Amino acid sequence: HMLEMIKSGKARAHTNIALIKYWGKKDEALIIPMNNSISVTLEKFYTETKVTFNDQLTQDQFWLNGEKVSGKELEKISKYMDIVRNRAGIDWYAEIESDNFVPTAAGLASSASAYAALAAACNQALDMQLSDKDLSRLARIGSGSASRSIYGGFAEWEKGYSDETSYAVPLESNHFEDDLAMIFVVINQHSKKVPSRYGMSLTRNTSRFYQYWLDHIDEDLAEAKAAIQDKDFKRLGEVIEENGLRMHATNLGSTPPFTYLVQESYDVMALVHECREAGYPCYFTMDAGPNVKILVEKKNKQQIIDKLLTQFDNNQIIDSDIIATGIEIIE
Amino acid sequence: HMLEMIKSGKARAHTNIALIKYWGKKDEALIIPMNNSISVTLEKFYTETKVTFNDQLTQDQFWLNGEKVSGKELEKISKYMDIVRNRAGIDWYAEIESDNFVPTAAGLASSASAYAALAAACNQALDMQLSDKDLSRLARIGSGSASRSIYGGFAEWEKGYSDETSYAVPLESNHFEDDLAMIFVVINQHSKKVPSRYGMSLTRNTSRFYQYWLDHIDEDLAEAKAAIQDKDFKRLGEVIEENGLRMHATNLGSTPPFTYLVQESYDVMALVHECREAGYPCYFTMDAGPNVKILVEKKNKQQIIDKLLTQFDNNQIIDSDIIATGIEIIE
């Protein structure tokens, strides 16, 4: 009977935002990065994924938000599932059922929560009994940023130098996360963006300014960590803001140059500078798109939102607390 | 009689464009730059200015392209005219009649040709008998870029350290100029431009990445010079392109950040890249706004233009040769 036979698992993984950036792979196939990155896991946004391994199934199937996925996005997941099968030692195809609670049409990436939730769901389904480190590794090989979603609060992706040694790790932050929040200003550009994987490879391999990134990444890592250990919000905010801008400065040097940012991104940056002037500490970061994220203290969250509303539509403004706990298995 | 008394003169000065960029002032009031800059003087674009010193005149009068000028633009030229009067040792007000042969509504800058042409007209009108040096000084104190427009071909603005020692000088290029052209791709940006004066000041005084500029500028100067003397086109173009990108990279670090570039600027950069790939050497540069300028060998000028026309409207495309001769006194 099917119920005697099937192997299944369900998990929830939250999105994380990199404060010190992942930008450039050392190894493309294996997803080993050129540098460590430090993230914060966000409580409002997540992916819930169920996996069901079944010996009768002839091909993997994938439903996302109740829609059947075909094309290259199925191809992508079936390649990942071959890796999971290889690691688990099982040849069964799977039905994957996923629901994104991440606004992805708003340009917020789901890669991070999607591969972490699928990794944790397989570990459940196949009784892999993986440690957090091995779990993180399994997520990493589908998506770099997902390695870090195994953890709540602050996480560091250790670059390592092999599939075995590249994984994320919890950073001790002594509850610093509970005092913090992030605000997203969602931005609609009308050109299609450089895809992140292609964008970062072009820049890493081709940018005239990439050495600039490399010359300063290790100081930034150490600075952010020491600010985190010391609960120093302005010291954290400053490195992370300059880190993120340097990430973007690198794309200007690529052959040919490209940008993630549009004029509205800069209007958001101008408002956050005004907020600091006005006595409200907050610091901005951008990822592989024009959206702007603002790290704030919870005590000032509403005050930053009110200032943003003088200039931005209510429907462009989304916030989230930082969640302190990690990846959750369901039932 | 008026004709026995008045002092008048008329001059023609061409625009120049900076291949190694002027970006940041050491002294705002005297327009002494942080670094040397290297420009090419363009044939197609110029200003012709007549000045008439008359003793009954009660203020300065300014006509531009046959329109009486009023407001801040008049104030600006009357301030500069005070400096000319002080230097010459005359107290008469002047009528200034200027015609721009520069598409200024296309966002092409006239400050380079305008103050050189005004400075040369005054030098004639008042018999100052200025050396090329001192005329370049007089131009500099109205607009930094204008110091360079006293010369044809390739000019270097030597930063010096005071009003006396800051002026431009000719570069020996052994007629390298005669083989080269520049193509402008005019771009209509939605947002209003960050004004250059304020722009380079905010960046000079505030940018987290301004040191990066300064760390590489002396090399860029020496490399550009060496490539000019050797008539080495690819070598010159590679420095000037990277130089101009770094300039723009600096604005990204400012407090708050800003950019002169729009998506359409990046599109022209992609096309110049494809031209190189296709065997047509050409190199791009950007000033304090979204237009893209392309340095090309004249042998390939039509070939670059044909490629640009696959993506851009004909009316966006303007070209100029490099004029080998300097500032002209009319009669």
XYZ file of C-alpha atoms in Angstrom:
662
model
C 0.000 0.000 0.000
C 1.137 3.555 -0.810
C 0.915 4.528 2.889
C 3.247 1.613 3.849
C 5.772 2.753 1.224
C 6.050 6.539 0.777
C 8.710 8.588 2.541
C 7.640 12.133 3.338
C 8.686 15.291 5.125
C 7.478 18.819 5.686
C 9.439 21.878 6.797
C 9.374 25.679 7.072
C 12.503 27.785 6.371
C 12.602 31.554 6.603
C 14.297 33.943 4.213
C 17.508 35.552 5.313
C 19.030 38.851 4.179
C 22.835 39.170 3.802
C 24.226 42.164 5.701
C 27.761 41.350 4.706
C 27.347 40.168 1.140
C 27.830 36.914 -0.695
C 29.165 38.203 -4.073
C 31.247 35.900 -6.282
C 31.741 32.171 -6.277
C 35.094 30.457 -6.083
C 33.405 27.307 -7.445
C 30.249 27.645 -9.626
C 29.148 24.009 -9.747
C 29.583 23.437 -6.045
C 28.534 26.948 -4.884
C 31.639 27.739 -2.868
C 31.809 31.457 -2.286
C 34.834 33.834 -2.625
C 34.081 35.084 0.894
C 32.075 34.534 4.092
C 28.736 36.301 4.390
C 26.676 37.250 7.473
C 22.890 37.260 7.486
C 19.839 37.919 9.560
C 16.846 35.435 9.306
C 13.438 37.146 8.817
C 10.355 36.041 10.612
C 7.601 37.329 8.225
C 8.934 35.648 5.091
C 9.395 31.872 4.667
C 8.772 28.851 2.452
C 6.875 25.735 3.524
C 7.833 22.626 1.584
C 6.507 19.082 1.700
C 8.385 16.258 -0.050
C 6.961 12.787 -0.766
C 9.203 10.045 -2.117
C 7.324 7.359 -3.937
C 8.679 4.315 -5.832
C 5.898 4.379 -8.417
C 6.581 7.931 -9.470
C 8.383 8.131 -12.842
C 9.645 11.731 -12.684
C 9.824 14.410 -9.992
C 6.824 16.683 -9.638
C 6.761 20.152 -8.180
C 3.787 22.363 -7.172
C 4.529 25.953 -6.131
C 1.709 27.941 -4.517
C -0.741 25.273 -5.879
C 0.469 25.595 -9.495
C 2.278 22.769 -11.277
C 5.775 23.796 -12.305
C 7.198 22.713 -15.655
C 10.051 24.043 -17.848
C 13.472 25.066 -16.509
C 12.271 25.617 -12.925
C 11.252 21.905 -12.776
C 14.545 20.978 -14.486
C 16.339 22.947 -11.769
C 14.582 21.212 -8.930
C 14.965 17.728 -10.481
C 18.753 18.281 -10.714
C 18.787 19.269 -7.053
C 16.699 16.178 -6.179
C 19.251 13.922 -8.023
C 21.874 15.343 -5.587
C 19.565 14.633 -2.593
C 18.874 11.107 -3.912
C 22.584 10.526 -4.426
C 23.397 11.675 -0.873
C 20.513 9.758 0.735
C 21.179 6.569 -1.310
C 17.655 6.209 -2.723
C 16.383 6.213 -6.322
C 12.739 7.217 -5.756
C 11.274 10.185 -7.594
C 9.336 12.735 -5.461
C 6.345 14.965 -5.333
C 7.386 18.391 -4.021
C 4.759 20.690 -2.558
C 5.860 24.172 -1.735
C 4.214 27.391 -0.621
C 6.106 30.715 -0.643
C 5.138 33.263 2.010
C 7.612 35.661 0.377
C 6.449 38.337 -2.054
C 8.478 37.172 -5.092
C 6.618 39.319 -7.685
C 7.800 42.169 -5.415
C 11.336 40.974 -6.322
C 12.043 39.372 -2.944
C 14.125 36.235 -3.599
C 12.811 32.803 -2.439
C 15.931 30.815 -3.334
C 17.202 31.015 0.288
C 14.032 29.695 1.998
C 13.020 27.375 -0.846
C 16.204 25.218 -0.877
C 16.551 25.217 2.888
C 12.915 24.086 3.338
C 13.372 21.384 0.659
C 16.679 20.206 2.191
C 15.102 19.941 5.700
C 11.984 18.200 4.284
C 14.167 15.553 2.525
C 16.250 15.025 5.741
C 12.936 14.368 7.437
C 11.460 12.211 4.615
C 14.594 9.999 4.173
C 15.719 9.900 7.827
C 19.127 11.345 6.865
C 19.484 12.604 10.454
C 21.825 15.365 9.213
C 23.495 17.771 11.635
C 22.852 21.473 11.149
C 26.240 21.720 9.348
C 25.436 18.871 6.931
C 21.901 20.269 6.517
C 23.385 23.642 5.631
C 25.723 21.990 3.065
C 22.769 20.204 1.455
C 20.909 23.529 1.078
C 24.077 25.357 -0.142
C 24.440 23.175 -3.241
C 21.049 24.247 -4.490
C 21.388 27.864 -3.371
C 24.237 29.685 -1.644
C 22.055 31.988 0.450
C 19.938 28.978 1.650
C 22.872 27.554 3.651
C 22.272 30.386 6.100
C 18.491 29.773 6.498
C 19.111 26.702 8.622
C 19.593 29.238 11.479
C 17.633 31.998 13.122
C 19.121 35.342 14.205
C 22.646 36.011 12.851
C 24.340 33.384 10.688
C 27.693 33.242 8.963
C 28.371 31.270 5.806
C 31.912 29.945 6.098
C 33.246 29.745 2.582
C 35.478 26.678 3.169
C 37.085 25.271 0.003
C 35.142 22.057 -0.686
C 31.611 20.677 -0.644
C 32.383 19.295 2.828
C 33.690 22.548 4.347
C 31.339 25.182 2.846
C 28.388 25.672 5.175
C 26.792 28.200 7.497
C 27.156 28.390 11.241
C 25.240 30.318 13.979
C 26.786 33.564 15.169
C 26.522 34.252 18.890
C 24.652 37.492 19.171
C 23.296 37.287 22.788
C 19.724 38.196 21.744
C 20.783 41.319 19.801
C 18.247 40.186 17.085
C 15.288 40.857 19.397
C 15.949 44.610 19.299
C 16.083 44.777 15.506
C 13.829 44.797 12.455
C 14.100 45.230 8.690
C 11.910 47.408 6.403
C 11.649 46.709 2.625
C 10.843 49.391 0.120
C 9.640 47.519 -2.932
C 10.600 49.059 -6.245
C 9.170 48.449 -9.704
C 11.762 48.920 -12.438
C 10.680 48.636 -16.001
C 13.779 46.957 -17.457
C 14.344 43.268 -16.716
C 17.237 42.808 -14.251
C 20.499 40.983 -14.630
C 19.856 37.484 -13.111
C 21.846 37.153 -9.906
C 23.886 34.041 -10.736
C 24.930 35.423 -14.131
C 25.459 38.937 -12.642
C 27.750 37.810 -9.814
C 29.852 35.516 -12.154
C 30.312 38.276 -14.708
C 31.471 40.687 -11.978
C 33.584 38.192 -10.048
C 35.332 37.046 -13.313
C 35.383 40.288 -15.275
C 35.008 43.390 -13.019
C 37.771 46.032 -13.053
C 36.627 46.861 -9.450
C 36.297 43.375 -7.972
C 39.740 43.566 -6.236
C 38.271 46.549 -4.361
C 35.623 44.140 -2.958
C 38.298 41.543 -2.094
C 40.667 44.120 -0.541
C 38.028 45.059 2.121
C 35.778 42.034 2.694
C 37.750 40.535 5.585
C 37.822 43.816 7.597
C 34.082 44.152 7.044
C 33.516 40.589 8.269
C 35.497 41.201 11.460
C 33.894 44.630 12.015
C 30.323 43.361 11.640
C 31.021 40.427 13.986
C 32.581 42.658 16.671
C 29.647 45.094 16.388
C 27.284 42.104 16.711
C 29.151 40.702 19.837
C 29.065 44.164 21.368
C 25.393 44.937 20.428
C 26.572 48.146 18.710
C 23.892 49.059 16.260
C 25.485 52.119 14.593
C 28.807 50.335 14.223
C 26.971 47.330 12.620
C 24.792 49.601 10.479
C 27.726 51.512 9.076
C 29.829 48.555 7.897
C 26.803 46.843 6.402
C 25.781 49.942 4.487
C 29.222 50.593 3.074
C 29.640 46.821 2.382
C 26.480 46.692 0.317
C 27.387 49.829 -1.694
C 30.829 48.400 -2.455
C 29.076 45.221 -3.728
C 27.184 47.423 -6.188
C 30.229 49.514 -7.023
C 31.796 46.284 -8.371
C 29.051 45.840 -11.025
C 30.095 49.171 -12.588
C 33.459 47.682 -13.474
C 32.158 44.477 -15.190
C 32.548 43.823 -18.934
C 30.085 45.306 -19.803
C 28.917 47.270 -16.696
C 25.450 46.803 -15.230
C 23.457 48.017 -12.225
C 20.801 46.583 -9.905
C 19.807 50.006 -8.641
C 17.371 52.490 -10.229
C 16.641 56.128 -9.343
C 13.926 55.184 -6.828
C 16.513 53.026 -4.944
C 18.543 56.204 -4.449
C 15.427 58.155 -3.258
C 15.094 55.505 -0.520
C 18.786 55.901 0.407
C 18.189 59.729 0.642
C 15.294 59.256 3.059
C 17.302 56.916 5.306
C 20.103 59.497 5.498
C 17.386 62.068 6.494
C 16.152 59.658 9.176
C 19.687 59.470 10.699
C 19.895 63.277 10.542
C 16.521 63.414 12.314
C 17.822 61.209 15.194
C 16.699 57.755 13.918
C 19.530 55.231 13.351
C 18.840 53.008 10.361
C 20.982 51.603 7.527
C 20.215 50.435 4.033
C 21.279 47.453 1.903
C 20.451 46.229 -1.652
C 20.670 42.791 -3.156
C 20.453 41.603 -6.792
C 17.606 43.985 -7.645
C 16.392 47.624 -7.026
C 14.456 47.048 -3.731
C 15.954 48.699 -0.655
C 16.092 47.040 2.755
C 16.534 49.040 5.914
C 17.918 47.639 9.109
C 16.372 49.544 11.999
C 15.972 49.176 15.780
C 12.410 48.089 16.657
C 11.988 51.208 18.837
C 12.347 53.321 15.693
C 10.598 51.072 13.125
C 7.364 53.096 12.998
C 9.259 56.416 12.892
C 11.247 55.249 9.794
C 8.000 53.942 8.171
C 6.268 57.350 8.749
C 9.156 59.178 7.122
C 9.165 56.707 4.173
C 5.416 57.300 3.662
C 6.060 61.015 2.948
C 7.561 59.756 -0.304
C 6.592 56.141 -0.868
C 3.256 54.393 -1.299
C 1.920 52.400 1.543
C 1.980 49.286 -0.677
C 5.750 49.593 -1.383
C 6.473 49.294 2.388
C 6.807 45.872 4.075
C 8.555 45.055 7.381
C 9.658 42.020 9.276
C 11.189 41.250 12.653
C 14.300 39.005 12.835
C 13.349 35.449 13.978
C 15.638 33.928 16.608
C 14.854 30.254 16.002
C 15.784 28.077 13.045
C 14.335 25.736 10.477
C 11.072 24.063 11.618
C 9.823 20.598 10.752
C 6.013 20.345 10.522
C 4.312 17.334 12.306
C 32.234 109.138 -29.127
C 31.368 105.543 -28.004
C 33.566 104.141 -30.833
C 36.580 106.038 -29.433
C 35.972 104.744 -25.938
C 34.671 101.087 -25.850
C 36.820 98.037 -25.542
C 35.513 94.979 -27.359
C 36.646 91.567 -28.556
C 35.141 88.347 -29.810
C 36.346 84.784 -29.490
C 35.502 81.203 -30.392
C 36.301 78.344 -27.938
C 35.421 74.709 -28.498
C 34.158 72.265 -25.919
C 36.566 69.666 -24.632
C 35.795 66.370 -23.010
C 37.743 64.863 -20.078
C 39.282 61.443 -20.871
C 40.966 61.344 -17.489
C 38.351 62.927 -15.311
C 38.242 66.072 -13.210
C 36.283 64.955 -10.168
C 36.549 66.821 -6.811
C 37.933 70.237 -5.842
C 40.721 70.943 -3.399
C 39.598 74.607 -3.305
C 35.940 75.369 -4.198
C 36.214 79.135 -4.517
C 39.318 79.126 -6.655
C 38.399 75.886 -8.588
C 41.692 74.107 -7.863
C 41.154 70.393 -8.543
C 42.142 67.334 -6.449
C 43.916 65.884 -9.494
C 45.044 66.581 -13.053
C 42.676 65.871 -15.981
C 43.218 65.149 -19.666
C 40.771 66.255 -22.325
C 40.231 66.256 -26.050
C 38.913 69.455 -27.772
C 35.971 68.894 -30.173
C 35.589 70.572 -33.578
C 31.808 70.403 -33.978
C 30.959 72.097 -30.647
C 31.893 75.651 -29.567
C 30.852 79.039 -28.161
C 31.474 82.410 -29.770
C 31.385 85.300 -27.371
C 31.639 89.034 -27.883
C 32.254 91.336 -24.933
C 31.965 95.138 -25.107
C 33.257 97.241 -22.227
C 31.374 100.550 -22.064
C 31.627 103.285 -19.306
C 28.016 104.442 -19.231
C 26.834 100.878 -18.690
C 25.355 100.418 -15.208
C 25.497 96.610 -14.887
C 26.624 93.709 -17.006
C 24.280 92.621 -19.747
C 24.224 89.057 -21.046
C 22.593 87.733 -24.263
C 22.797 84.014 -24.940
C 21.695 82.729 -28.359
C 19.897 86.091 -28.865
C 17.924 85.947 -25.572
C 18.587 88.429 -22.758
C 19.794 86.452 -19.746
C 18.333 87.153 -16.300
C 18.426 85.660 -12.752
C 21.185 83.393 -11.355
C 22.874 82.929 -14.731
C 23.349 86.741 -15.019
C 24.601 86.920 -11.348
C 27.107 84.172 -12.127
C 28.551 85.930 -15.119
C 28.551 89.308 -13.353
C 30.598 87.693 -10.539
C 33.051 86.339 -13.067
C 33.160 89.699 -14.837
C 34.151 91.308 -11.495
C 37.189 88.970 -11.474
C 38.037 89.965 -15.064
C 37.702 93.687 -14.161
C 39.889 93.154 -11.087
C 42.527 91.296 -13.082
C 42.479 93.856 -15.971
C 42.245 96.892 -13.681
C 39.182 98.436 -15.309
C 35.826 99.205 -13.707
C 33.542 99.353 -16.743
C 30.574 97.097 -17.050
C 30.190 95.005 -20.223
C 27.652 93.750 -22.683
C 28.268 90.047 -23.391
C 26.846 88.472 -26.536
C 27.331 84.795 -26.741
C 26.214 82.092 -29.183
C 26.373 78.408 -28.157
C 26.959 75.931 -30.954
C 26.492 73.114 -28.423
C 23.256 71.115 -27.974
C 22.811 72.212 -24.340
C 19.173 70.969 -24.205
C 20.732 67.581 -25.092
C 22.627 67.938 -21.800
C 25.942 68.782 -23.441
C 27.895 71.191 -21.247
C 28.779 74.714 -22.397
C 30.768 75.843 -19.307
C 34.054 74.650 -20.961
C 33.560 76.641 -24.128
C 31.593 79.538 -22.533
C 34.266 80.709 -20.029
C 37.216 80.081 -22.367
C 35.495 82.146 -25.068
C 34.599 84.885 -22.462
C 38.126 84.851 -21.126
C 39.609 85.085 -24.608
C 37.153 87.870 -25.624
C 38.091 89.939 -22.518
C 41.821 89.352 -23.150
C 41.299 90.883 -26.582
C 38.871 93.648 -25.496
C 41.189 94.954 -22.742
C 44.666 94.189 -24.215
C 45.675 91.991 -21.255
C 48.204 90.265 -23.570
C 47.794 87.038 -21.543
C 49.999 84.029 -22.154
C 48.216 80.767 -22.862
C 48.861 79.912 -19.172
C 47.233 83.089 -17.799
C 44.305 82.854 -20.165
C 43.752 79.264 -19.029
C 43.867 80.591 -15.378
C 41.274 83.252 -16.216
C 39.066 80.572 -17.821
C 39.624 78.115 -14.895
C 38.184 80.485 -12.254
C 34.823 80.521 -14.037
C 34.691 76.782 -14.826
C 37.410 74.183 -14.310
C 36.839 72.365 -17.578
C 37.209 75.656 -19.551
C 40.907 75.923 -18.602
C 41.440 73.077 -21.083
C 39.583 74.728 -23.987
C 42.419 77.266 -24.609
C 44.047 74.375 -26.506
C 43.222 72.063 -29.393
C 43.935 68.302 -29.485
C 44.990 66.893 -26.080
C 45.333 69.183 -23.031
C 46.341 68.571 -19.431
C 44.929 70.630 -16.604
C 47.753 70.832 -14.037
C 46.130 71.029 -10.584
C 48.806 73.245 -8.986
C 47.981 74.594 -5.591
C 46.815 78.228 -6.037
C 45.034 80.551 -8.515
C 48.506 81.176 -10.047
C 49.594 77.551 -10.534
C 46.317 75.909 -11.559
C 45.824 76.017 -15.367
C 45.986 73.778 -18.447
C 48.825 72.940 -20.711
C 49.036 71.301 -24.209
C 49.977 67.611 -24.497
C 52.307 66.570 -27.317
C 50.339 63.944 -29.215
C 52.213 64.109 -32.547
C 48.911 64.533 -34.490
C 47.292 61.390 -32.817
C 44.170 63.650 -32.681
C 43.776 63.624 -36.465
C 42.848 59.890 -36.419
C 40.221 60.062 -33.722
C 36.579 61.042 -33.288
C 33.953 61.027 -30.535
C 30.332 59.867 -30.810
C 27.760 61.165 -28.345
C 24.631 59.205 -27.546
C 22.135 61.655 -26.147
C 19.884 60.276 -23.426
C 16.700 61.817 -21.988
C 16.529 60.979 -18.306
C 13.183 61.290 -16.413
C 14.630 62.636 -13.146
C 16.423 65.939 -12.766
C 20.234 65.692 -12.802
C 22.435 66.131 -9.700
C 24.271 69.436 -10.581
C 27.980 68.814 -11.226
C 29.429 71.427 -8.864
C 27.437 70.119 -5.913
C 27.825 66.564 -7.158
C 31.624 66.479 -7.123
C 31.698 68.344 -3.794
C 29.343 65.882 -2.069
C 31.454 63.057 -3.461
C 34.858 64.637 -2.721
C 33.943 65.502 0.838
C 31.814 62.582 1.809
C 32.272 59.511 -0.402
C 33.337 56.245 1.307
C 34.956 55.352 -2.060
C 36.697 58.657 -2.918
C 40.058 57.288 -1.637
C 39.761 54.587 -4.310
C 39.703 57.354 -6.945
C 42.827 59.040 -5.452
C 44.620 55.675 -5.076
C 44.553 55.127 -8.864
C 44.503 58.566 -10.402
C 48.297 59.145 -10.807
C 48.731 55.785 -12.626
C 45.755 56.571 -14.870
C 47.344 59.914 -15.726
C 50.720 58.504 -16.534
C 49.203 55.600 -18.483
C 46.993 57.851 -20.573
C 49.917 60.188 -21.350
C 52.154 57.266 -22.332
C 49.476 55.871 -24.685
C 48.959 59.300 -26.366
C 52.744 59.724 -27.084
C 52.879 56.205 -28.460
C 49.652 56.749 -30.541
C 48.360 53.563 -28.862
C 44.562 53.551 -29.238
C 43.514 50.446 -27.266
C 45.885 51.334 -24.436
C 44.452 54.878 -24.173
C 40.881 53.666 -24.503
C 41.213 51.031 -21.842
C 42.475 53.546 -19.218
C 39.982 56.279 -20.084
C 37.096 53.812 -19.932
C 38.117 52.360 -16.582
C 38.949 55.900 -15.257
C 35.448 57.171 -16.089
C 33.793 54.126 -14.540
C 35.753 54.678 -11.266
C 34.616 58.323 -11.224
C 31.068 57.128 -11.277
C 31.842 54.414 -8.799
C 32.766 57.194 -6.327
C 29.277 58.735 -6.335
C 27.869 55.418 -5.040
C 29.762 55.922 -1.743
C 28.522 59.467 -1.092
C 26.276 60.516 1.840
C 23.700 60.083 0.447
C 24.578 58.085 -2.740
C 23.626 59.213 -6.225
C 24.259 58.265 -9.861
C 24.458 60.120 -13.185
C 23.826 56.905 -15.107
C 20.484 55.425 -16.233
C 19.623 52.033 -17.792
C 19.965 53.605 -21.242
C 23.554 54.668 -20.466
C 24.328 50.952 -19.702
C 22.721 49.964 -23.032
C 25.198 52.147 -24.941
C 28.017 50.534 -22.861
C 26.820 47.015 -23.924
C 26.816 48.144 -27.564
C 30.379 49.511 -27.395
C 31.458 46.182 -25.860
C 29.824 44.277 -28.792
C 31.539 46.671 -31.233
C 34.933 45.754 -29.707
C 34.028 42.094 -29.910
C 33.092 42.564 -33.585
C 36.540 44.069 -34.294
C 35.784 47.831 -33.934
C 37.919 49.406 -31.138
C 35.966 52.087 -29.285
C 35.806 53.204 -25.651
C 33.096 54.934 -23.611
C 33.086 57.732 -20.989
C 30.428 59.596 -19.004
C 30.369 62.955 -17.367
C 28.016 64.554 -14.865
C 24.902 63.200 -16.592
C 23.510 60.199 -18.586
C 24.931 60.792 -22.095
C 27.493 58.249 -23.334
C 30.553 59.463 -25.236
C 32.522 57.085 -27.407
C 36.103 57.657 -28.428
C 36.726 55.936 -31.762
C 39.297 55.927 -34.622
C 37.790 57.887 -37.523
C 38.221 54.748 -39.767
C 35.593 53.031 -37.607
C 33.314 55.999 -36.825
C 30.553 54.993 -39.396
C 30.786 51.350 -38.250
C 30.173 52.283 -34.584
C 27.294 54.606 -35.650
C 25.646 51.801 -37.759
C 25.758 49.485 -34.731
C 24.333 52.179 -32.463
C 21.426 52.737 -34.868
C 20.250 49.115 -34.314
C 19.246 50.161 -30.796
C 19.114 53.991 -30.681
C 17.248 56.629 -32.721
C 19.290 58.570 -35.266
C 18.487 61.791 -33.468
C 20.337 60.511 -30.354
C 23.575 60.205 -32.339
C 25.999 63.125 -32.688
C 29.645 63.005 -33.628
C 32.629 65.282 -33.726
C 36.195 65.169 -34.838
C 38.968 66.439 -32.577
C 40.115 70.002 -33.560
C 43.903 70.276 -33.511
C 44.053 74.073 -33.096
C 43.144 76.160 -30.049
C 41.069 79.181 -29.122
C 40.304 81.675 -31.954
C 40.160 85.431 -31.847
C 37.457 86.674 -34.285
C 39.152 89.454 -36.445
